[model samples]
Target: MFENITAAPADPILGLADLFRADERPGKINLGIGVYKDETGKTPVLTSVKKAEQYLLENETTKNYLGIDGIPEFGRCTQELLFGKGSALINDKRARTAQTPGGTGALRVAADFLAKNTSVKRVWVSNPSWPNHKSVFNSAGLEVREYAYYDAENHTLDFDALINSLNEAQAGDVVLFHGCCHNPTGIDPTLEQWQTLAQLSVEKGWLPLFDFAYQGFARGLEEDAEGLRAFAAMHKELIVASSYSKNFGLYNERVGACTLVAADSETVDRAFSQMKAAIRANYSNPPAHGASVVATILSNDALRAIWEQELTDMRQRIQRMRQLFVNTLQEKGANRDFSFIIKQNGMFSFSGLTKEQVLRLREEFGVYAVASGRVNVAGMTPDNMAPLCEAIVAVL
Candidate 1:
């Protein structure tokens, strides 16, 4: 049995991190991983999160496990954050939530729920979605397919192709959307485009699933949620997997929620019970500390305010880096237009570098980026911007 067990390939992103770490070259820029890093190349814990932990230390009692659905307040606050507090779904008790380890865990739970409880056996994701989107859904026994998303040559959303593919979806088929920040490719749909997609989804009777990992990274929390909110306003049923890892800087804590919106209160009531059962079978319950920490911050007026400000700052910094990157590329006299970098939102820029160029950059300059050419904007800083641009220009 041991001899027959074959070794699996290393994860693409993690493999790059390992290679970057092993390289002894100075000024090695690691743009492969998707985590948020500060100007000093550090993943700093948010001040609000620190304060919330202190609050939990003073007010908390025991380490007893939460129910299969985790803390009720955590669910409530998370629901409010994803869908506004005044959302009709929440007000009418049409929305139900279950806490999970992280967005990945929430997605896993959602996939499991759909596969076991619902008629949906097929799901469509963006053509260039996060790698795990395909793997997790496939592992959960759902047939995974892709729709047109980013236009690589033009560096834009292939809107017509996307609409065409989605139009072909059968009723009750699950369709996945990036709620805000599209991973791997920072491209996102315009508000009008989102409206069109929502209308099409309703017409096709497709069940929408939003993977919302970076709520505040693309825009303000509420502003970034406009697409989901628009869809919720029309559709009675939906699925959302949310993560606090990026917003709260609680990556290791594994905090997230899977929110299901049913057609009515009765459906919510029935569906939520099934969701709990699913969670119970999978992991029994979510971890306690991360949810409690988030709840503490979300509930407190002052802490919540501070967290929002910090999130805004992070978004602004990424935007600045995007601009700085493009400007540096232009300054370096790269013949090609680098304007696409400015249009991209969130932490990534699909830089259009070929696998050969990426490997060359890694080998020659120790500047590690994904083979797909996705460079993490959060990993850039004023100090490294010039050199990174120079390296790219050299490779080109």
Candidate 2:
């Protein structure tokens, strides 16, 4: 088996780390990177995260394994965060949640559950989605297809095309949505658009799935969730995969959850039994530390406040970077407009450059970007802004 195998291509996103490390160029930049970087280009551990762990270290009494769905408190916190403080979904007991390894893990579990229990065929993702979305669903033996999303010519969400593309999905097919802060493109729908999407989804009869990895990165924590809630108001059944990696600054901790919702408590009970089976077959149970850390902070008022403030600070910084990036580009004398970047949210923006332009920006200017024109806005800082803009200007 080993003799017949061929070398695999490097990961589209992670391969950049090696290429970046190998480069000896002074002041090199890597927009091909993922994760949040501070103004100093460091990924900071949230103070709340640190404090929670300290408390756990002092107070935690056992090293035993968790249940297949992890701690009950962790599940409660996740449901509250997704729906609201006193969400109707919780009161009615319409949702069941399981702690997962990360957003990726939750997505994998969702795929497995869908494959095993439902009539779902192909899973439809937005065009220009996170590349791994396709891989995860495909690995579960589900067909993966794309719906129209971004209009590269205008650099905006093509609402008409998106709706039109979604029309192709059959009644039993599962359709995936980025709950907020869409990856790679960062273009999200307006509230009105979300209403339309919700109504259409209800009318079309396809199951809806939301990948909610960047809850607070787009707008305020609550505001960012409005779109998802809008859908829930109209549709009684859906799926959500939540990631605490970004908002909680728990990147390495791999905190996330998969939530299943149904019309009533009885249906939820039936659905989630199968959901738990999916989890049991996967990692058996989630890593206990991160879920405990999250539950501790989310339930404690003082720790929750600290986390909210830190999250707000991080959100504000990214917004500032978006504004500064556009202004800097204008100052550097690039004629093409980048104002849309300011309107976008989360860690990414589609810089609208071709693969050729992206490569030139890298090889010629030592500023790395994905060949598909994706850029991680979190990588920008005041220190690097001037040179980054200059590199883009030259490439333009």
Candidate 3:
């Protein structure tokens, strides 16, 4: 069996990261993986998380399993963070949650849950979504299809095309939306656009699934969740997969949650039991450390405030780097204009570099970017900004 197995292609993003790490070039810059980095080129653990860990370490005694759904408090706090604390959905007891390994795990769990419960068999995602979106859903035995999203020609959102494509989705079909800070291409819809989508979702009876990996990175927590909130408010049902990896700096901790909002209290209870069964069949139960850390922080007022401020600081820093990048490109008078970089939100920017250009940047200049030209803006530091621009300018 092992001898007959064929080798699989390496993941583009992770493969790029591997190459970047192996290269001994002194000036090498890694703009490959979606991980957030500070100005000093480090993904530091949050202070709030550290405090929470200390509290848990001191008080916690048993290492008992958390059952299939994981910690109840973790699920509650995570749900509150996704939908607002006072969200009518939560107050009406219409939403149910289960802790998972991470955002990817949440997506997988949600896909499996949908496969078991709903008649729908397909999930429609943005054209250039996170590459794993397809694989995870496909593995769960659901058909994965794309809807128009990014406009490669002008480097903007193809809103009309997207709206048109989604209009064709069958009722009960799952439509995936990047809750905030769209991956690869950081183009998100405006509030008005979200409202339009929400209305369409209601009219079309499409089941909305929000892949909310970078909640605080695009805007404020509440502000970033506007799209999901809009859908949850208008629609009686929706699904949300939220990650603490980016916002809480809990990447390695694998902290996230999957929430399903149903028509009413009865549906919520029934759906949650199904989700628990799904979780039990898949991973038995989620790990405890990460969720425990998150719950401790979210449950405490002081810790929550600190985490919010830190999240805001991280968001602002990424914005600062983005501005610096666009400014330098213009100030240096490169042949190509990269003004769209500023408009893009979150950590990643679709740099408009071709595959050939990306390869050249990696091989000739020791600069690594995804083949699709998606670069991690957080990877740029004040020290590396000028050099990185010079590398791109040379390639162009």
- Residue 119 in model 3: lDDT: 92
Model 1: per-residue lDDT, tens digit, 282-388?
A: 99999999988898889889999999999998999999999999899989987889888888889987899999999999999889898888899999999999889
Candidate 1 off by > 4 Å:
none
Give the Å shift of residue 143 in candidate 2.
0.4
Best candidate according to lDDT: 2
Query: TM-scores for all candidates?
Result: 0.98, 0.98, 0.97
The collision pairs in model 2 are none
What lDDT would candidate 1 get against the real structure? 0.91
Q: Please count the clashing residue pairs in each candidate, in the order shown.
A: 0, 0, 0
Over the stretch 100-194, how does candidate 2's per-residue lDDT look in tens digits? 99999999999999999987879999998998999899989999999999998999999999999999898878889998999989999988998
* lDDT per residue as tens, model 3, 1-396: 699888888666568878898998879999986788998998888999999999988999999999787898998887877888888888889988899999999999999999998797999999999888999999989999899999998889899999988877989899999988898898999998999999999999899999999988887888998888888889988889989999999999888999989889998899889998999998899999989998888888999999999999999999999999988877666867777888888998889889999999999999998888889999999999999998888888
